[PDB]
Amino acid sequence: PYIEKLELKGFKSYGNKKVVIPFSKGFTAIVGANGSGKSNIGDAILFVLGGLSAKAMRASRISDLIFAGSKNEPPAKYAEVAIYFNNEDRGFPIDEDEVVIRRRVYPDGRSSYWLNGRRATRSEILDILTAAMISPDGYNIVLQGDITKFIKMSPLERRLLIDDIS
Amino acid sequence: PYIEKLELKGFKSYGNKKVVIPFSKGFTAIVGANGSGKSNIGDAILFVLGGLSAKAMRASRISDLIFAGSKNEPPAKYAEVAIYFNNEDRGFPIDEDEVVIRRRVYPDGRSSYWLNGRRATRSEILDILTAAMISPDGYNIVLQGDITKFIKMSPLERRLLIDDIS
Amino acid sequence: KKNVFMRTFEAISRNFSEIFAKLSPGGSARLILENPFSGGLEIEAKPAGKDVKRIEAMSGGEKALTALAFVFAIQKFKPAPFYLFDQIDAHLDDANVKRVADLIKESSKESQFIVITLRDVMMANADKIIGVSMRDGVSKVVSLSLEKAMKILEEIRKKQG
Amino acid sequence: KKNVFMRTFEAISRNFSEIFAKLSPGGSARLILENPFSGGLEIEAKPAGKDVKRIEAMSGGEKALTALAFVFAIQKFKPAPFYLFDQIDAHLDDANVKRVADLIKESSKESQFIVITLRDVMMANADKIIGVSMRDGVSKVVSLSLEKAMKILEEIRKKQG
Numbered sequence: 001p002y003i004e005k006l007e008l009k010g011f012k013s014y015g016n017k018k019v020v021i022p023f024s025k026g027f028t029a030i031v032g033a034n035g036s037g038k039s040n041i042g043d044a045i046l047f048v049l050g051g052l053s054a055k056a057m058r059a060s061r062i063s064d065l066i067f068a069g070s071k072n073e074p075p076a077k078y079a080e081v082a083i084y085f086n087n088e089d090r091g092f093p094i095d096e097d098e099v100v101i102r103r104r105v106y107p108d109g110r111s112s113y114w115l116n117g118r119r120a121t122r123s124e125i126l127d128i129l130t131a132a133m134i135s136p137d138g139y140n141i142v143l144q145g146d147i148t149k150f151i152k153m154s155p156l157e158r159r160l161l162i163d164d165i166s
Numbered sequence: 167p168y169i170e171k172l173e174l175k176g177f178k179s180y181g182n183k184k185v186v187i188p189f190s191k192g193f194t195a196i197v198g199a200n201g202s203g204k205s206n207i208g209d210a211i212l213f214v215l216g217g218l219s220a221k222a223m224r225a226s227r228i229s230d231l232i233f234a235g236s237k238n239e240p241p242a243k244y245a246e247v248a249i250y251f252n253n254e255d256r257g258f259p260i261d262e263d264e265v266v267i268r269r270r271v272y273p274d275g276r277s278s279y280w281l282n283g284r285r286a287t288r289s290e291i292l293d294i295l296t297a298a299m300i301s302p303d304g305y306n307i308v309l310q311g312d313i314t315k316f317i318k319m320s321p322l323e324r325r326l327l328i329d330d331i332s
Numbered sequence: 333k334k335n336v337f338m339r340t341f342e343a344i345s346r347n348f349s350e351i352f353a354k355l356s357p358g359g360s361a362r363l364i365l366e367n368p369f370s371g372g373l374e375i376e377a378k379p380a381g382k383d384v385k386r387i388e389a390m391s392g393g394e395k396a397l398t399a400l401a402f403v404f405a406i407q408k409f410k411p412a413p414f415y416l417f418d419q420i421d422a423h424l425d426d427a428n429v430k431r432v433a434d435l436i437k438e439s440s441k442e443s444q445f446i447v448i449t450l451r452d453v454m455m456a457n458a459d460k461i462i463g464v465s466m467r468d469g470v471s472k473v474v475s476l477s478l479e480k481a482m483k484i485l486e487e488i489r490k491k492q493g
Numbered sequence: 494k495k496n497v498f499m500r501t502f503e504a505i506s507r508n509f510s511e512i513f514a515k516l517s518p519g520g521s522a523r524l525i526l527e528n529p530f531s532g533g534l535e536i537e538a539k540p541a542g543k544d545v546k547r548i549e550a551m552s553g554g555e556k557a558l559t560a561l562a563f564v565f566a567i568q569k570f571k572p573a574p575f576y577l578f579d580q581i582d583a584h585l586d587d588a589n590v591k592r593v594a595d596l597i598k599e600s601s602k603e604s605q606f607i608v609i610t611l612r613d614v615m616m617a618n619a620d621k622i623i624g625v626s627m628r629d630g631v632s633k634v635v636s637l638s639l640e641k642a643m644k645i646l647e648e649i650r651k652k653q654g
């Protein structure tokens with residue numbers, strides 16, 4: 001399966017006016033001035049798929065991912081991200097052409113997940129992602145600065161990485 | 167004063183066949199494929215002006231700056247760099263339109279300096295450079311990776327830097 | 333353990349060499365083990381003409397390209413439905429960026445690729461371009477075509493005032 | 494000490510604000526002290542529209558631009574006969590690279606500048622271009638004109654095979 005689009009609402013630099021981000025089934029390039037919100041789109045994906053740590057998403061607290069009041073706009077009541085997955089070849093264990101996963105986080109740090117509408121648990125979502133070969137252990141997400149890290153690594157840490165791959 | 171050109175002989179990736187590198191009095195851009203020898207030119211300048219540490223020049227030992235035998239070429243007997251300075255406005259304490267500083271390092275780590283031909287001591291060279299406002303404390307040389315460092319710095323280390331500037 | 337660890341290592345290593353050879357024409361790179369697993373994993377790369385040196389002795393740009401070869405190799409071992417790359421071409425030159433971009437365009441026929449780059453050579457190889465911009469602290473998105481994206485870039489390069 | 498330390502700090506800080514304001518149109522940046530010298534030196538930057546945040550909270554690119562403003566400010570305090578910059582534009586976008594390049598082109602009338610960059614926007618602003626290349630492990634240099642340098646770059650961007 002592949003990502004059709006990505007809806008953001010009050011997530012990091014994306015205001016209260018819901019934003020829709022469409023992707024090509026093939027190769028998509030995200031460009032923009034420095035500090036415009038390119039990496040935040042990456043953050044939205046990490047987040048909606050079971051965003052473990054606020055640190056990898058450069059946030060002190062998980063609650064800092066909520067849109068911060070700006071010039072002509074109040075702060076969000078919460079942060080929401082809904083990624084639409086294309087389920088034609090049936091990579092997931094569901095009987096549905098379209099799979100939608102939605103996550104919402106509140107000022108208190110509470111997070112609610114949704115699967116095609118129904119409420120769900122991170123664990124169920126993680127399991128549906130895993131069945132589609134979408135996992136943190138797949139290393140399919142390379143963050144700003146990760147290459148510079150794969151470099152610093154010592155032959156040791158490097159040998160240990162293939163340990164986990166095994 | 168300003169740099170007219172830069173002669174390299176057996177220095178790092180520059181072979182035994184002496185290479186001459188001319189510079190504009192104004193703005194010069196050095197371009198080239200990755201791993202072609204762009205930064206080594208920077209290294210040649212650090213080196214010829216009193217190259218303190220082999221580390222900042224990415225060399226285990228000071229002797230590793232000597233050209234390493236290649237396909238159709240033997241290793242250098244030594245590494246030499248001669249930078250030609252334009253002395254018209256008399257930035258230096260010498261009475262000469264052209265100031266030339268030459269440095270040579272041998273497999274044993276011995277280094278010989280030359281000033282407009284005559285042999286000289288690092289200390290005399292350092293002093294002539296200092297009189298021309300050319301010093302390590304001038305921060306006029308920003309190496310590959312330095313910006314990434316000025317970033318990592320903590321507000322502490324940063325306060326300490328202006329200490330040295332004072 | 334060391335029975336399967338070698339099954340994977342041989343699989344990943346096999347990938348690292350073929351990818352690298354593509355990114356570095358006329359060159360090669362192997363993932364030789366220090367203890368054929370008490371020590372570590374070393375990387376030896378050798379481009380066209382130059383001698384063999386451990387990754388830590390290469391130039392910044394060569395290190396970044398070699399590291400990518402490694403990463404790409406780990407992804408080939410366990411293929412994902414999509415990939416998100418944020419600035420993986422920050423140290424590569426126009427020629428090298430193009431090689432990485434052609435590789436990504438190729439694999440693009442089987443898995444989905446979302447690359448965030450500031451380089452023009454990288455975006456120009458994409459099927460779609462998403463331009464991000466900000467106004468008064470608010471991020472906005474707009475689907476930019478290949479021509480419109482280039483016009484903006486050519487304008488930055490013109491001598492204005 | 495704190496009598497002169499403030500004489501310099503006020504000098505450098507004054508520079509940081511004016512340079513930054515040039516690199517970030519409509520924006521600003523101050524070097525406020527944590528203890529007006531028991532603590533440290535903090536950096537607060539505020540671009541056009543966005544709120545004020547310490548350098549450590551900015552985006553990678555904004556951090557690199559702000560850091561450069563700082564560096565440039567220290568160089569203005571103690572002017573050198575020449576400057577050598579190696580990859581100071583590795584994280585900046587085409588628009589930001591151009592701003593740094595125009596600033597360097599400007600100061601270029603008084604001090605000498607030797608910048609090593611892989612970006613085309615940076616080299617295109619230079620009075621002279623030195624192209625480095627390697628063959629069989631040996632580095633070579635050649636004085637490339639503005640047209641010839643661009644031809645090579647346009648060729649990399651064409652769709653070959």
Ligand SMILES: Nc1ncnc2c1ncn2[C@@H]1O[C@H](COP(=O)(O)OP(=O)(O)OP(=O)(O)O)[C@@H](O)[C@H]1O
Pocket residue numbers: 011012013014032033034035036037038039040041064065066067068069144469543551552553554555
């Ligand atoms: N919770 C939030 N509310 C409002 N703005 C936020 C929030 N979290 C982050 N931001 C803004 O996001 C911006 C950084 O975004 P991002 O990392 O996406 O930029 P970028 O385009 O990747 O930059 P670069 O090209 O330099 O990497 C900063 O200006 C920051 O103020």
Ligand SMILES: Nc1ncnc2c1ncn2[C@@H]1O[C@H](COP(=O)(O)OP(=O)(O)OP(=O)(O)O)[C@@H](O)[C@H]1O
Pocket residue numbers: 177178179180198199200201202203204205206207230231232233234235310382390391392393394630
């Ligand atoms: N003593 C030496 N003898 C021969 N070659 C050397 C020597 N020291 C360094 N080199 C070669 O110099 C090259 C790296 O040079 P340099 O750092 O100048 O490249 P670069 O053009 O700056 O690369 P990048 O754009 O990736 O930063 C390596 O290929 C290395 O093998």
Ligand SMILES: [Mg+2]
Pocket residue numbers: 038039144552553554
């Ligand atoms: Mg970013």
Ligand SMILES: [Mg+2]
Pocket residue numbers: 204205310391392393
């Ligand atoms: Mg370099």
